[PDB]
Amino acid sequence: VKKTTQLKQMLNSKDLEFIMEAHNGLSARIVQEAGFKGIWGSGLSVSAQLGVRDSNEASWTQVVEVLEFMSDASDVPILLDADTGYGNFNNARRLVRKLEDRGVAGACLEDKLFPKTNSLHDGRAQPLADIEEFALKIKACKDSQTDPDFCIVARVEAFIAGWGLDEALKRAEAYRNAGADAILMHSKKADPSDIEAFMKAWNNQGPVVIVPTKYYKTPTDHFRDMGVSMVIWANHNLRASVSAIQQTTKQIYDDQSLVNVEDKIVSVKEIFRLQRDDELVQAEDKYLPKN
Amino acid sequence: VKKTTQLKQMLNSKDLEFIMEAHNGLSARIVQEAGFKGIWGSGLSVSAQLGVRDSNEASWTQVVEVLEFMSDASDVPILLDADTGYGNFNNARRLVRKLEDRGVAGACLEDKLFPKTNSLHDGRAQPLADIEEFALKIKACKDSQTDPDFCIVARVEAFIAGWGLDEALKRAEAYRNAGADAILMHSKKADPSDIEAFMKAWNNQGPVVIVPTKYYKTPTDHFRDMGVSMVIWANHNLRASVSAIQQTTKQIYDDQSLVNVEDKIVSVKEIFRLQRDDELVQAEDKYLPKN
Amino acid sequence: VKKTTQLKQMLNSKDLEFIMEAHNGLSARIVQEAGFKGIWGSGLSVSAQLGVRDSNEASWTQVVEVLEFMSDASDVPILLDADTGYGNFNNARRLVRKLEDRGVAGACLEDKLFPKTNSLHDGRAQPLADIEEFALKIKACKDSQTDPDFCIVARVEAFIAGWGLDEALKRAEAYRNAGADAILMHSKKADPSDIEAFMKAWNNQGPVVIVPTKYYKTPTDHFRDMGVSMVIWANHNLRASVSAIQQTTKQIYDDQSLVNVEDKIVSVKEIFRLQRDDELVQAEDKYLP
Amino acid sequence: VKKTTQLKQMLNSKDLEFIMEAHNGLSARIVQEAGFKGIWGSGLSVSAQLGVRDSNEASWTQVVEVLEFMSDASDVPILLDADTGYGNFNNARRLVRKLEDRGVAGACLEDKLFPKTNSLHDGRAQPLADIEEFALKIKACKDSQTDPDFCIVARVEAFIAGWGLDEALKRAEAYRNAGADAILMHSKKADPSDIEAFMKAWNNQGPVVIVPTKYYKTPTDHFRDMGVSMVIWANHNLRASVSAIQQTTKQIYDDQSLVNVEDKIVSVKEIFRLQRDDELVQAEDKYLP
């Protein structure tokens, strides 16, 4: 069934669902083959892989293109981390159109200003979007959809910006009232206190998504206990990939030889396998003169 | 000094030089920080990361764009693996122009047909380009350069295609006579016999580059002994990166928790560090109203 | 209604249908407003507007992005002139999937080699693709489409390459048998004799498309009499735009004033209307708090 | 000679210089052939030709790729109309580095918010950027260029936004002090009174650029008398091209024939000449074995 429908069911299941980050077509295929039911198109990981910062440096179409290759390499839905929507309601609704066309399942937008600053920094400025304004941006995206199953997740940055539960709840309520398919409540505390607080006051008004990067020590069953609908593992493949490349590059640099890595890395045939080279081999058998 | 000049010196040093593969801006930065003096813009790794095959599926401008992000993230030269030049002499000379503009240091072109098939496959067809034709393609690229230090490496695929030393030498001689900055002699044997054979007959007519992926057991000092000018570690960061992502994704998938990977992967701050987030922090200090 | 279907109906209709060249989003929208039921995404015109040659210099993705903007600005189908398919069957089938996703209604592939040379050149070598290979490339595109109505037009360049009816017919038959939704029979003659001979020998095996650029004085009812399914007006909007820009630029350059061009060009409000600025105005009243 | 230098000489010259709007590689090459010494990479015209609005819908990289093709097709400098810089100082400085790499000679940034609205609209809100912030954005672009001759033009939208000379002058002075190579003072009046008043109060602090679109009946020598350094013909080639396409399409649509357009548009050989096909012919004799 449609990737959009797959993601919507997930956001709406009372069951706790999990999406894993991917940041390129290769990693999207890997996450798929692992069994994950959804993919998180991480804004940080996509910017990082390109070698730029997570501050809207690469253009929205450069992001979308990375996402197109990812969509093509995967059968499970991708929820794009669309930052603040790359501009106003009009830039956001144009983004949704391009997203739908590429097979991307949903877009997550955070209530800050363009260009944004990664939520994980401390001390940095985290100005928030006006509430009525942001809600209308959420509504324009929903209003503008062609496929009714496409998802719009509204990310509340109130705790991240030093505001309280009061603000967090007003904005979550507003975004939900504007048609958001789920609310992503964010927090950068090493514990889940902001989340516990929010979930308690929310009174299960709608599905809630969380990103436990900072409070990763919290047992997952606690999230189930709170009634969270989905958890996003945000940037670990990007992070694992950097450890590997630094370790590998240093070893080859030091040895001036491949002997100490050849057996610690996937083979060339595994690469060809993940690129689905065999399919092409079938196709050439069928579409090229035998002689 | 120019990245082009840096690469040219390397190809011309009698000293054995080493370039390491990178396939995105993040990995190009990592290879740089490791001490490598050059980067191999692997056609396989760039296609693989995008989730496609190494058969000219992504367009040449999609490849060039990945390469632009890589160039921007690095101070050392990048030698692009330009497949067969993405078409005829005209498609190749247009490519050189775009390459020079992006700060890419050189392009390597192999003597096969567009679209190509990865040299590492066995049994697959590996038709070779006509010799006079290919040589003229090499000359048009050199002829068409603006920066005289830009490098054109001619990759001979004769051994790869099942031909002998005789063919390999005629084509190497032709490509060198056409102005190539070095000849990349290829082989997929688990030993360096084709290379030993070629080096013996070449009589050090010009610089020779090799890719020891398949005969990786050969001691590097043997290459020095043969008078090889450069060695290319072709696809190991891509390969290390896939092992890491598969391992990481499987662990999180199984645990439904981050506990068993958080300490096995680079931190978020290391990510911010490789994106040079601090530079931006300086810049905002300088270009944004304090209040 | 659906673009691929609209284009497939036109190729299959008994009546002579017409599509007009557009080369950017603006020209596609003008073509639609004029009433044309389809657009020819001219390779010559897309390459020319970019300032490059009709020699596969711009990549296939740069062509596809121009086409995406064109598709976004129109409701009628666009038939892309996809040269030789930008490489082999695999390059063609990847292109078909991207075109379907961007809303393009079909692709037209010609039986020459990558990179190609424009058909209108006199004396330029026009090496033809092997018949079997090209027919397998057509079948590949057909086998790979996900919209059953997406069309694939196979263009025969035999007459263009200096060959005869024999070659042209063998080629057209192979491609049709491969599954082409229509055959584009090409000729650079100032008369329609190559087309007449082909139409006679064809026995109406399937829909035929033609491009009267060089034999334009031929009365259009004659094409109808021949059973021709579609005519393409191939590069006239591009050519008209160059005349217009060349004139306006010269005028302003000479006068160092706009007084003599201001009354001869459309108003800025017309540009806004063509850009659909009123739709933004309506969205802004809903969504700008 | 070098494009950035050529553009910097024009801004600094005492004489009234002129640049003409181009919106794609083809129009840039025509503009150059006409003799113009520089090109205005119009935001309105680039967006319009794509079929989208002048509201930062196309991304900044899509605009930059149109500009790259334009730059590749011309020897004279292009001044890009870069709207508000496509975001904050960081988005502007990244854009400057890409423009330098693609051969673009300079950027023109206006003191409004991202995403912007075209200045010519009547009644549309035109919220201005904070003076200090915008001045720091200009300084950032200046601090970040690697070619010292690359130009940065700061556009003052005060009059456009409904403000007075006071606001317009404070803004122009801040930006100039920030390092702008020239100030573009804008007005949508049918007369040049806003420009006259500004020029009087300016005391020739630095080069001023103007865009006479709405006050075009003003005699050009009057701008010279005012000490104006450069005039931009902002959207006339785009507007001329729409008139031409609209006419040609209608004609062909009505006639279902090319006989009445064939004699009114440039030849296919002219398109080849503009594409520089003869250069390919010369390369093919050297390099095609």
Ligand SMILES: O=C([O-])C(=O)[O-]
């Ligand atoms: O960018 C990301 O991964 C995020 O915001 O979670």
Ligand SMILES: O=C([O-])C(=O)[O-]
């Ligand atoms: O693509 C590659 O890495 C190669 O050819 O070595």
Ligand SMILES: O=C([O-])C(=O)[O-]
């Ligand atoms: O490019 C074109 O317009 C053609 O081939 O007809």
Ligand SMILES: O=C([O-])C(=O)[O-]
């Ligand atoms: O977009 C344009 O042409 C302008 O602002 O002048």
Ligand SMILES: [Mg+2]
């Ligand atoms: Mg993010």
Ligand SMILES: [Mg+2]
């Ligand atoms: Mg390769």
Ligand SMILES: [Mg+2]
């Ligand atoms: Mg064509």
Ligand SMILES: [Mg+2]
């Ligand atoms: Mg503008």
